[PDB]
Amino acid sequence: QAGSYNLALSYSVGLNEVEDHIKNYRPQCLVLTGPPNFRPALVDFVGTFTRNLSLMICGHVLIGPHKQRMPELQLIANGHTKWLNKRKIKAFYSDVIAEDLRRGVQILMQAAGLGRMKPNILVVGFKKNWQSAHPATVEDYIGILHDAFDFNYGVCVMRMREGLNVSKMMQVDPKALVKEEQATTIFQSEQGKKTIDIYWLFDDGGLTLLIPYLLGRKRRWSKCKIRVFVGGQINRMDQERKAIISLLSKFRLGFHEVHILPDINQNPRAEHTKRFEDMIAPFRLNDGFKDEATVNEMRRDCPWKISDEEITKNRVKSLRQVRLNEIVLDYSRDAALIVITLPIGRKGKCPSSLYMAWLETLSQDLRPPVILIRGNQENVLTFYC
Amino acid sequence: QAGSYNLALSYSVGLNEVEDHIKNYRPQCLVLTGPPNFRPALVDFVGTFTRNLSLMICGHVLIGPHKQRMPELQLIANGHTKWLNKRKIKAFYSDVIAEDLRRGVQILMQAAGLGRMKPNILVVGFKKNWQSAHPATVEDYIGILHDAFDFNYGVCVMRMREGLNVSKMMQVDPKALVKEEQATTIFQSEQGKKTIDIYWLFDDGGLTLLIPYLLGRKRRWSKCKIRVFVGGQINRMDQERKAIISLLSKFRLGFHEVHILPDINQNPRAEHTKRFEDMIAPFRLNDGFKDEATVNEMRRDCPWKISDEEITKNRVKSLRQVRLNEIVLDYSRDAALIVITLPIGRKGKCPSSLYMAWLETLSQDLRPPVILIRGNQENVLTFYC
């Protein structure tokens, strides 16, 4: 019954004609949980949020190198859509055939959606395992974030203790795993109780705040004082805030206490640097970029000599990141989702391994569900005034 | 708080529970036009039908592999969509950046739409000048069709009465302002007195009875004495031809015009084969296939003639297709529009060259409007039962 199909003609192609000056930043969201059943925590998070607010599209990559295996793959599609309908999700299931992940997502990236409805931001299933397989996977991984930076997309990433890409270890009518799942995915069912905190070191990319926001609109998160952990300058705090509270009169917050994070400065802890170093060893010049090695070799020799980009000029950034984790452990010891601003790395000025290590620090172990965001700074305040 | 975006989203997700059952094979189509001001004959064409019926997606692929105009893509689209919208069209433009035609449309076909809302038919604009220069583009153009075949899509070619690309402007132009589109408007603006001529040399194509059905059922297309030319059984007109007549009801055809023209593949004109050959005389070698020549070398070293692949034994299909050309030119003679069934070539037993050769010879003698068509062995009787 393609009724909506037809209805779309009058409504959604009636949505194609709508003015462009509306500029409402529709939070169209794209996700990469691979198979929907797996990495279901991201599905849940992106489902409770945008529950009849914004478009959420599930992109499963089959990394096929040959003729579509079978039309049965379509069956698999209906099975995944039923899995989504066996719970309360509003997901579309789509697939892209490719030979790797970077191009694998890249296909689905600029062709998913249609006209105005097109996805606007992207969340990626974090391959927590990164010190096991070849770094190629890591290079592909930094690929999606960099491409999202080049396509005016929003970058987001989750992380879990047991595993976003939980091994699903096995360690009859099985009922909805939701119960156990929601234990790992409070948003899925559990009404949020503890406070969400936006460690939005970065101001722009409104979603950084919008995400926990339309998350807050949610009844589950209605039980969590939306904590605003701003950080940076210490000399003047409310001076910038008054701009933020103007746009807050627009975006109702209901709070006026932003906790200062002076940890990023004058608060460097040696033992946190030693771990990071011991956490980036086989990752020095492990991008497998022979050309980089060559061009570098004819420029400068050592894997940490030519480092206007190699964890040197941006080293202070690594300090800031580990400090952010330390104030997660102190300032927000416990929280619903630690929303840190997803870092920014310049192509040609920030190497892949450095950035990936930064993310690993920002989402280290022994933390509750954690989410990172960084928007494309198109415009702010468009939604909900 | 009614809203217009959330309603389209709600109808789409309601359709997320749509029934794979009774697959609604609406004429979901994917269209190549490049810039919308150029090749607008396809625009109007696929705009004629599926007006408030299904989804027609326009597709422009930017061929510049360097410096993706992330800043100058939405704006140009806006302008182009406004132009298109000014034409009161019903589509969803799409912008793609890539290095070549082949992978460019490969990106678009397998990722356009969302969930069940997905395009199913591809139409590709012919290149008026293919043999004048740039020989290697034959590979790309034929790979279009082969990958579309392998992708279980619908396939169509586009070549109208006049030249394809509009490159003579410097002496209305914007269809938005004025859209002559005579080649297409003829069917609707002028009251059509001549009819569609189809054929069945490839019975597998189910779409053959749908694309003529769709277009055959439009307000202005009301005037049509449907000439259902089909290779009906030479002895039976009531169980094989009526096999289509029992089904005829759902396609709302109401025509027994099964014009038996068994001269479908009779020995063609001597002259026609001659032209068919020296057409490929310049391309006698597999120039775009040194690699494949080495394969020939190790396999009977066939330099130009290819056993049962070019003309050594494949001529069969060539002389048949040309006979079709004779037919169209004799029976149809002046043909308002022709439903030309795109022939089938499976990779590994026939070259892209011959495929192109076939495409070119479909309507090489003159310049009729190419209303090419072929289906993907999909089920039918979706529209109007």
Side-chain angles (χ1 to χ4, degrees), chain A residues 1-2 4-5 9 12 16 20 28 55 67-68 78 85 91-93 95 97 110-113 116-117 150, chain B residues 5 9 11 15-18 20 24 26 28 54-55 70 78 91-92 97 110-113 115-116 118 150-151:
Chain A
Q1 297 295 347
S4 89
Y5 209 92
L9 280 309
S12 70
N16 194 16
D20 184 26
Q28 303 108 348
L55 171 153
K67 158 71 183 62
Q68 295 76 6
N78 297 283
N85 300 325
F92 321 106
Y93 176 91
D95 163 55
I97 299 303
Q110 42 187 284
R116 345 286 298 274
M117 269 188 170
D150 325 298
Chain B
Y5 208 93
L9 269 72
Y11 283 49
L15 195 78
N16 291 182
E17 262 287 3
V18 74
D20 191 1
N24 300 163
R26 287 149 284 89
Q28 311 162 308
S54 189
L55 178 57
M70 12 170 182
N78 298 340
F92 268 98
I97 198 78
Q110 56 177 345
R116 299 306 286 258
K118 286 189 176 180
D150 194 290
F151 261 45

Side-chain angles (χ1 to χ4, degrees), chain B residues 259-355:
Chain B
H259 295 215
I260 179 62
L261 310 180
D263 58 354
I264 290 179
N265 295 152
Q266 312 303 339
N267 49 348
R269 332 304 177 184
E271 70 166 26
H272 259 87
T273 302
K274 186 274 187 178
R275 182 42 52 186
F276 177 80
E277 188 64 13
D278 40 18
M279 181 206 157
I280 197 182
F283 326 98
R284 59 191 59 180
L285 308 182
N286 50 359
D287 186 18
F289 314 93
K290 170 51 185 177
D291 304 1
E292 171 57 84
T294 66
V295 180
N296 307 336
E297 297 162 12
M298 68 189 63
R299 292 306 308 177
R300 283 61 53 89
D301 197 6
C302 51
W304 39 89
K305 81 294 296 182
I306 318 295
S307 179
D308 199 10
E309 181 166 1
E310 177 56 26
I311 56 182
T312 307
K313 174 184 175 60
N314 204 347
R315 270 288 285 92
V316 183
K317 307 296 112 180
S318 68
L319 56 86
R320 295 178 180 273
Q321 186 302 317
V322 73
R323 167 53 59 178
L324 308 175
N325 196 356
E326 325 294 356
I327 299 176
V328 158
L329 182 51
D330 175 23
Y331 161 79
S332 311
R333 260 296 303 179
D334 304 359
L337 86 164
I338 321 89
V339 156
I340 307 111
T341 303
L342 155 54
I344 177 164
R346 190 44 62 211
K347 182 36 38 162
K349 322 168 303 174
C350 39
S352 299
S353 61
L354 189 39
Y355 214 78

Side-chain angles (χ1 to χ4, degrees), chain A residues 155-324 326-354 356-379:
Chain A
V155 279
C156 327
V157 59
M158 172 145 178
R159 194 141 151 161
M160 273 339 301
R161 284 179 286 188
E162 42 271 44
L164 300 177
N165 308 187
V166 45
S167 63
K168 312 297 187 304
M169 60 213 308
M170 61 178 180
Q171 327 296 341
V172 176
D173 297 351
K175 301 181 179 302
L177 295 174
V178 172
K179 308 178 283 63
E180 174 186 3
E181 185 188 355
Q182 65 81 24
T184 82
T185 66
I186 160 178
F187 37 78
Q188 184 183 15
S189 73
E190 171 58 20
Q191 168 161 5
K193 167 200 55 56
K194 45 182 80 172
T195 57
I196 209 167
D197 40 9
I198 49 181
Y199 281 58
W200 62 295
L201 192 158
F202 180 45
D203 47 345
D204 225 337
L207 297 82
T208 308
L209 173 149
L210 307 187
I211 301 307
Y213 167 67
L214 316 82
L215 200 45
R217 188 91 55 91
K218 169 68 63 178
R219 313 311 170 184
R220 313 290 60 80
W221 307 76
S222 66
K223 287 185 177 302
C224 326
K225 284 170 337 200
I226 311 174
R227 279 204 284 176
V228 201
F229 283 61
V230 317
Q233 79 295 341
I234 55 187
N235 40 0
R236 290 289 175 172
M237 308 310 300
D238 298 3
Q239 93 291 21
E240 300 160 1
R241 296 188 50 182
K242 68 157 88 218
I244 324 311
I245 61 182
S246 64
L247 56 78
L248 278 194
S249 177
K250 320 306 172 182
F251 257 109
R252 170 182 175 88
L253 172 61
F255 309 102
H256 304 276
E257 175 190 357
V258 316
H259 306 184
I260 292 169
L261 307 188
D263 189 6
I264 55 184
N265 184 23
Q266 306 167 5
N267 298 152
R269 314 313 173 184
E271 76 282 10
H272 311 149
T273 78
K274 323 278 172 295
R275 164 52 187 174
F276 169 80
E277 307 149 8
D278 304 355
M279 199 178 60
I280 59 187
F283 314 96
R284 60 93 173 176
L285 194 51
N286 196 14
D287 54 358
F289 211 122
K290 306 177 181 179
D291 305 357
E292 274 293 347
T294 61
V295 174
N296 292 324
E297 280 153 345
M298 52 86 88
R299 286 277 65 66
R300 320 283 183 284
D301 52 342
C302 314
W304 38 105
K305 183 48 211 77
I306 173 58
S307 300
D308 54 342
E309 43 74 29
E310 180 63 20
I311 328 183
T312 296
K313 305 307 297 299
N314 35 27
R315 186 182 300 97
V316 54
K317 208 162 206 282
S318 57
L319 288 304
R320 301 153 185 270
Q321 302 334 294
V322 78
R323 306 167 180 239
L324 303 176
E326 304 323 295
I327 39 184
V328 179
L329 207 46
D330 180 19
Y331 267 85
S332 66
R333 193 156 193 87
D334 189 14
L337 330 170
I338 308 85
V339 153
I340 321 90
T341 281
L342 201 150
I344 174 172
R346 300 208 76 262
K347 35 157 166 78
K349 323 282 212 163
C350 167
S352 89
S353 66
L354 167 67
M356 155 59 193
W358 281 351
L359 316 204
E360 161 187 10
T361 86
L362 299 211
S363 49
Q364 260 200 351
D365 57 346
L366 290 155
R367 270 74 145 187
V370 54
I371 288 284
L372 284 83
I373 318 277
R374 196 206 191 290
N376 76 35
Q377 46 87 42
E378 165 188 47
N379 45 54

Side-chain angles (χ1 to χ4, degrees), chain A residues 129-146:
Chain A
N129 47 350
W130 87 296
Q131 308 188 357
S132 57
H134 302 271
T137 75
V138 152
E139 286 313 275
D140 278 282
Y141 192 88
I142 179 51
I144 321 90
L145 300 61
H146 262 107

